[PDB]
Scaffold this motif. Structure first.
Motif, PDB file in Angstrom:
ATOM      1  N   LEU A   1       0.177  11.144   3.984  1.00 15.75           N
ATOM      2  CA  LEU A   1      -0.152  10.135   3.316  1.00 15.75           C
ATOM      3  C   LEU A   1       1.533  10.689   1.849  1.00 15.75           C
ATOM      4  O   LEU A   1       2.125   9.849   1.861  1.00 15.75           O
ATOM      5  CB  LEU A   1      -0.947  10.347   2.118  1.00 15.75           C
ATOM      6  CG  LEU A   1      -1.721   8.725   2.628  1.00 15.75           C
ATOM      7  CD1 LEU A   1      -3.340   8.832   1.063  1.00 15.75           C
ATOM      8  CD2 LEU A   1      -1.820   8.272   3.752  1.00 15.75           C
TER       9      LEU A   1
ATOM     10  N   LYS B   1       4.971  10.361   3.909  1.00 23.49           N
ATOM     11  CA  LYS B   1       5.925   9.200   4.707  1.00 23.49           C
ATOM     12  C   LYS B   1       5.037   7.935   3.991  1.00 23.49           C
ATOM     13  O   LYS B   1       5.360   6.823   4.639  1.00 23.49           O
ATOM     14  CB  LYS B   1       6.373   9.357   5.591  1.00 23.49           C
ATOM     15  CG  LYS B   1       7.998   8.956   6.077  1.00 23.49           C
ATOM     16  CD  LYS B   1       8.126   8.480   7.706  1.00 23.49           C
ATOM     17  CE  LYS B   1       9.364   8.207   7.596  1.00 23.49           C
ATOM     18  NZ  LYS B   1      10.230   7.377   6.600  1.00 23.49           N
ATOM     19  N   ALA B   2       4.049   7.719   3.112  1.00 25.36           N
ATOM     20  CA  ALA B   2       3.287   6.474   2.961  1.00 25.36           C
ATOM     21  C   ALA B   2       4.759   5.455   1.998  1.00 25.36           C
ATOM     22  O   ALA B   2       5.045   5.883   1.637  1.00 25.36           O
ATOM     23  CB  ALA B   2       2.322   6.691   1.957  1.00 25.36           C
ATOM     24  N   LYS B   3       4.193   4.341   2.575  1.00 25.90           N
ATOM     25  CA  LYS B   3       5.087   3.380   2.663  1.00 25.90           C
ATOM     26  C   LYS B   3       4.921   2.925   1.004  1.00 25.90           C
ATOM     27  O   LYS B   3       3.751   2.757  -0.052  1.00 25.90           O
ATOM     28  CB  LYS B   3       5.021   1.579   2.673  1.00 25.90           C
ATOM     29  CG  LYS B   3       5.926   0.642   2.640  1.00 25.90           C
ATOM     30  CD  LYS B   3       5.167  -1.167   3.604  1.00 25.90           C
ATOM     31  CE  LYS B   3       6.017  -1.568   3.747  1.00 25.90           C
ATOM     32  NZ  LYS B   3       7.480  -1.391   3.480  1.00 25.90           N
ATOM     33  N   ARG B   4       5.884   3.004   0.313  1.00 29.20           N
ATOM     34  CA  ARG B   4       6.050   2.802  -1.301  1.00 29.20           C
ATOM     35  C   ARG B   4       6.688   1.449  -2.149  1.00 29.20           C
ATOM     36  O   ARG B   4       6.590   1.336  -2.630  1.00 29.20           O
ATOM     37  CB  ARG B   4       6.307   3.731  -2.112  1.00 29.20           C
ATOM     38  CG  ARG B   4       6.208   5.665  -1.047  1.00 29.20           C
ATOM     39  CD  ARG B   4       6.050   6.696  -2.254  1.00 29.20           C
ATOM     40  NE  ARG B   4       4.689   6.411  -2.828  1.00 29.20           N
ATOM     41  CZ  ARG B   4       3.740   7.765  -2.691  1.00 29.20           C
ATOM     42  NH1 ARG B   4       3.486   8.423  -1.279  1.00 29.20           N
ATOM     43  NH2 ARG B   4       2.708   7.659  -3.568  1.00 29.20           N
ATOM     44  N   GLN B   5       7.439   0.987  -1.103  1.00 33.89           N
ATOM     45  CA  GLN B   5       7.816  -0.756  -2.021  1.00 33.89           C
ATOM     46  C   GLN B   5       8.505  -1.532  -0.583  1.00 33.89           C
ATOM     47  O   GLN B   5       7.765  -0.966   1.047  1.00 33.89           O
ATOM     48  CB  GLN B   5       8.909  -0.341  -2.488  1.00 33.89           C
ATOM     49  CG  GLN B   5       9.138   0.371  -3.336  1.00 33.89           C
ATOM     50  CD  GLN B   5      10.690   0.648  -3.815  1.00 33.89           C
ATOM     51  OE1 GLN B   5      11.579   0.757  -3.526  1.00 33.89           O
ATOM     52  NE2 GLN B   5      10.593   1.209  -5.308  1.00 33.89           N
ATOM     53  N   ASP B   6       7.825  -2.382  -0.735  1.00 29.53           N
ATOM     54  CA  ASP B   6       7.846  -3.631   0.010  1.00 29.53           C
ATOM     55  C   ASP B   6       9.076  -4.005   0.900  1.00 29.53           C
ATOM     56  O   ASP B   6       8.863  -3.283   2.406  1.00 29.53           O
ATOM     57  CB  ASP B   6       8.255  -5.130  -0.596  1.00 29.53           C
ATOM     58  CG  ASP B   6       7.024  -4.986  -1.403  1.00 29.53           C
ATOM     59  OD1 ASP B   6       5.787  -4.969  -0.973  1.00 29.53           O
ATOM     60  OD2 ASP B   6       6.749  -5.778  -2.296  1.00 29.53           O
TER      61      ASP B   6
END
Lengths: 184, 184, 188, 184, 184, 184, 184, 184, 184, 184, 184
Positions: free
Chosen positions: F164, F166-171
């Motif tokens: 997790l 490089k998980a997406k963290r912002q829209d």
């Protein structure tokens, strides 16, 4: 094609003037109404020939938008039936008029012949009334009370006679078939 | 294609005239109407051949807008059936006429054959009445009571024997097959 | 394509003539009507082949607008079934004719087989009535009772014999497949 | 695309002549009718192959316009089912034929298997009746009582032996994959 | 697009030849049937792969025209369910075949699993029956008793061992992603 | 637009090849059916990602033609629910497959959760069944019993660990936002 | 316009890569299932913002194909309500996904508020299920059991803080009003 | 025209950025709700104006797909009414969102005024929920609990005095009438 | 075609001037209303001729949108029937007006002619009211009470006497037939 | 034509700015709610003229998508009627808004006049509610409590005296006739 | 044709300015409501002439979307009838307004004449209310209370005299026929 065929100036002007003419007594029939005044009318086949001649065989059209059987009542073995029909007449340019016709049969012991009488007369009645809308020449005069007793003041004419000599005797029609070959 | 081809002036003129012609005694039959005198009519296959010759085998068309069974009644072991049909006839240019036809079967003991007769006669009756509207040559003259009286004033015709010699021998139609091949 | 193919003059005229032709006794059958006279008719398979020859296999078409079972009656272990069908025939140029046909089954103990007979007969009957509207050659002559009296004039025919020597025996049709064949030869 | 593809002269000609052929005894099966004669018929898979070779795999098509269960009757522990199907066959140029087929199951104790049998048999039967309208080669000969007489006058022959040496054993079709790739 | 993609000659000829092939014993399964010999059939996942290789993953399509639950019967705490489905298969050029499939569940006590079994089997059964109208290679040979007899004489083979060496293990498809990118 | 595209040869060829691949054990899950042996399946979210990677996020689509609640039965305070869904998957060039899915909830006391479970699982089940018609890589291999036995000859590896980091963290999606601006 | 806007290579490729991303713990919420363990979910307003950033405010759309109230039950003055919704999401190029969502309200004493909660949650739930078919970034990861295991092993971190200093406080948007005027 | 007008690159990126903004406390209202919670919401007339400034008076549109009265209940001379509405919002380029809104009236003694409040609240509520899908600036922030927490940590502000000096006092509008004349 | 021809500059201007004209006393009839003073109306056939002259026989069209029988009541052997009809009139450029007409039969002992009277009068009654909407010259003046006052202040004019000398005598119309011939 | 006529850059800017205007006290009315506060509203004719001036007489349009009578209750010899109407307003460019209006009549003794009041006011109410979505100037300010506060602080202005000197006195409008004649 | 003809700049500006005009007392009638205020209205035929003159005989159109008889009540030998009609008015450019009208008959003993009155009033009532939407000149000021009491302040005029000299006396219309001939 039919419905997209716009009238030319020459054909339009001729038909307009032709429709004003009133019908002579050769065209009108009569029968005394039950208990009341002798109602004058035009027979179906005369109207069709008028229309066929007025617009051409491919110049007008008609359809039955709807027909409805109002009632079949049985009282002491006799049938009473009224039927209306809604008939729409159209010309080659899209013009149209629609009207109602009615049909009646009372007292027969055959339910079938009752319905046959009513269903049929309803349609031609509607066809005649629909065609009237195009002008005097197709029956619009028959209800002009002023026009009517003008007819009564004309000498009672004895019926015409049709000459069946040059009558069509075979199915074949070489004149049309020649012209049709030049179509394809 | 059908519903689109405009009549040429050539073909229009010929068909317009041809349709005015009255029908000779070759075409008329007579039955004994319910409760009334001799009734004149034209048999279906003659109307068909008239139309096929008048307009071409591909020049006219018909469909059954609707057929309704008005009743099937069982009285005295015999079935009484009335059937109407609405039949619309159309020509290659889109012009059209629609009318009602009626079919009756009274007194037969087969419910099946009663329904069959009435359904089948309703359709043919509607096709004839629709075709009438196109003019005298397709049956509009049949109701002109003047035409009918003049018709009786002709010598009785004898059954014309048909010469079955050049009858169609095989299914094959070589001239058609040649023409059909070169149409591709 | 079908419904939009207009007849050539060279094709229109040939068919117009051919449809006038009356049918010889090779085409006509008869049976005993219920309680009455000899009724003549044309069998379905002949009307079909007539239409196929008059118009081409791809020149005419038919559809069933509607079929209605009028009744299924059970009387004394026997079924009575009447069925109508509305059959519309169309030619490749859009011209068309529609008629009603009828189908009957009396006396069977199988309801299934009664309905099967009536439904199918109704359709074939309606198909024939629609095709004959196109002219004598497709069956319109059968009702001309002068034609029928003239039919009883010729000596009764012997039944034609079918020669199965050249009967089709494999699905393949090289002549047909050849007409479709495209060499696919390229330029290189 | 399908329904819009005219026949070339060469293909029209070959198919028209090919459809006239009557079928050899290899195509014909026979069955006991209930209480009656041998009934001859063609099996569905044979008609399918006939159609695929006659028209091409993409040259003909069929759909089920409607299927109706006429009845499911239970009498003495057995089910009786009749089913009709309306099957419409179309060729790639838009020509078409539609006919009714019927499916029957009598005597089985499973309502499930009764309905399965009749529903499928109705479709196949209707497909066979529709295709036969294109000509003898697709089954129009089967009802020709003269055709059936000549069939009886042939030596009753063996069944064919199928040589499975070239049977498909793998999904892949390089010739199809090549032809399909070269088409984008 | 699909339904408008006429076949090229090169692909047509390849597929027409290819659909003629009979299937080897690798495709055929068997169960003993009640009252008859072994019944041969082809499993759904094989027909799907046949269709995918024959036409391309995007060359054939299917929809469910209709599905009908004929009955859910509860007898002795057990459910009897019959379901039919009408399945229409189409090729990219618009060619099509439609057939009925049937699904049966007898003897289960869970109504849920009865309906699930019958509903799904009906669709797959219908898909198989529709695809086989395109030819022998898609299953039309399975009904030819001569083919079946010849299959029986064939050496019985042990199942294929499947080699999972290069089974797909990750979602990404680099060659696909490259080709898809280029095309935009 | 969607439905009106057409695969390039490059994308067609890559996808046709990729769909033949069978799935490794990473994709396969299993459950013991009620009263019977193990059933192998692919989880929905895996099928979704396979389709998205196979076809592109904008390359495939699905809709629900219909959903039907077969029954909601209350038995001794427990609910039994069966639901079907018809799910049609379409690719960007218009090819399509439709199948039925089924959803079951048996024995729970909450009617709300029973309907929720059955309704949603029916849709996912139908989507899975529709997509697998496209080939092995979308689940068609799961029915190959030889494929399944070959899977059993593989000791089950441990569950993958997800990184997790490089998980997406912002829209916000800068790469997307840059490309989208240029495309107007 | 919407539904007709093919993706450019750049926008397609960014989005394809972006949708593969799994979601960070900022996006993931949890509740307790009735009688069981932890269930993770994504709040609607976060899925809406994901979609708006992934596709652009004008890049995706959704409609309610149908909503059904499955039941309104009254138990001891408390209402139990289940509602489903079918929600179809479409992208600007016409690709689409549809799914079912469910909405539940149990125990409130107001029938009105029960229906309101259930009706609205079914729609949002359906939107979430439909959007997740586009890929991991729109919620497909939440069902990956491995992703959830890795997610619970990350630090549970503080509730985010929203900085309302730059919050909109008046309706007018001069940057927008500028661009819109330069477009007519 | 409306539904057809694509967004320019400038107007797109202006609106995309602008829609990200969360709303300041000028937009937010609160009512008390059953159970003690403080419920935050945005008033309808503020959402309409937000939409009119974001999209232009002609840049967005909305319709009522359906409104249904769930119930009208009478208890102790007071009426309880719940009404839902499905409201679809469309932008000028065809993009769209649809949602359900709910309207509630409890405790009034006039049945008429209860239905009026409920029908009217359902529509406005549905419009609010539908517009919300375009982004934060149209209400998507309202459900973010972090956004709500941050709103309370702000000093409260006096209601802004509206200056009616420049208020419209006659119907006539010269600036538009000038511009409109120059268009015909 | 009809409904597609836009008026010429001066045809409009002439018709626009002509329709304002008020009608003379030749057109107006009067029937003593039941229990009240005189009610004036215009008879159907004159309105038809007015319309035919105002617009041309092919310049206006009318259809019956719908007809309904409000009641057929039997009281002491007398029939009471009310019928409405909705009539739509159209001009050659597509302009149109629609209105309702009513038909009444009170006191007749026959059911059939009662329905006949009501249905037929409703239609024409409906025709007049629609045509009235085109302007004063087509019947719009009959409702102006000042116009009716000025009418009574007019010399009581004797009926017309129509001159049947130039009445139409034979079907054929040579001038029309000539013009029709040269239009193909 | 209407529905298809895009706004020019200049007219859009004028109407956009014009619609922001709040309405002066000349437009605002008030009323007692039954037991309720002062309700402010705009009378129907004022909105009609507002729209006609804002958009042009041919710039906006409206229809009744549906009207439904919720109830007609007879209570204490008085009638209670609730009626809703759904009203859709469209601008010449295709922009649109739809809303619900409600109509109420309580306490009248005539059923007829009760329904009339309710049916009529629902339509006007819905039209007003639909129009106000275009902006403050068309009625959206009425719900802003801060706007309503300024209204109280403004002097209660009198009902204006209207100058009937220039009132239209004859139907004829010559100036228009020139421009329209100039156009054909 | 009608519905497709855009207004010219000259014609728009003339109609816009003209519709603003208020109507003089020549147009206004009055009838006292039962027990209450004197209510002003415009007679139908005057609106028709206003509409015909404002827009041209071919510039405006109207249709009846629907008419409903809400109730037919017989109380003590008297009939009470309420009827609504929905009437849609359209201009030649496609602009439109629709409204509801009502028709009332209370106290008559003839059911027929009651229903006739109500049906006809509703249409005219609806036509007037729809037309008033185009501006003051077509009836929109009739409800403005300042305008209304200002009307009484004007010298109460007795009805002007109508001059029947130039009345249209024959059907024939030479001026139109000239323009109509040249239009072809």
């Amino acid at each position: 094609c039919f419905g997209q065929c716009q009238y030319t100036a020459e054909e339009y002007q001729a038909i307009q003037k032709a429709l004003r003419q009133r019908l002579g007594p050769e065209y009108i029939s009569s029968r005394m109404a039950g208990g009341g005044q002798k109602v004058c009318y035009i027979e179906g086949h005369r109207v069709i020939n008028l229309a066929n001649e007025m617009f051409g065989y491919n110049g007008w059209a008609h359809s039955i938008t709807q027909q409805n059987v109002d009632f079949v009542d049985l009282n002491n073995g006799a049938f009473y039936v009224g039927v209306c029909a809604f008939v729409r007449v159209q010309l080659k340019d899209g013009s149209y008029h629609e009207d109602v016709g009615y049909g009646v049969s009372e007292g027969l012991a055959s339910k079938a012949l009752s319905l046959e009488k009513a269903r049929k007369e309803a349609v031609t009645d509607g066809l005649k009334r629909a065609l009237r809308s195009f002008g005097n020449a197709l029956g619009n005069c028959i209800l002009d009370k002023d026009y009517l007793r003008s007819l009564n003041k004309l000498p009672r004419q004895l019926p015409l006679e049709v000459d069946l000599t040059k009558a069509k005797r075979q199915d074949l029609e070489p004149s049309v078939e020649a012209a049709r070959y030049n179509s394809c």
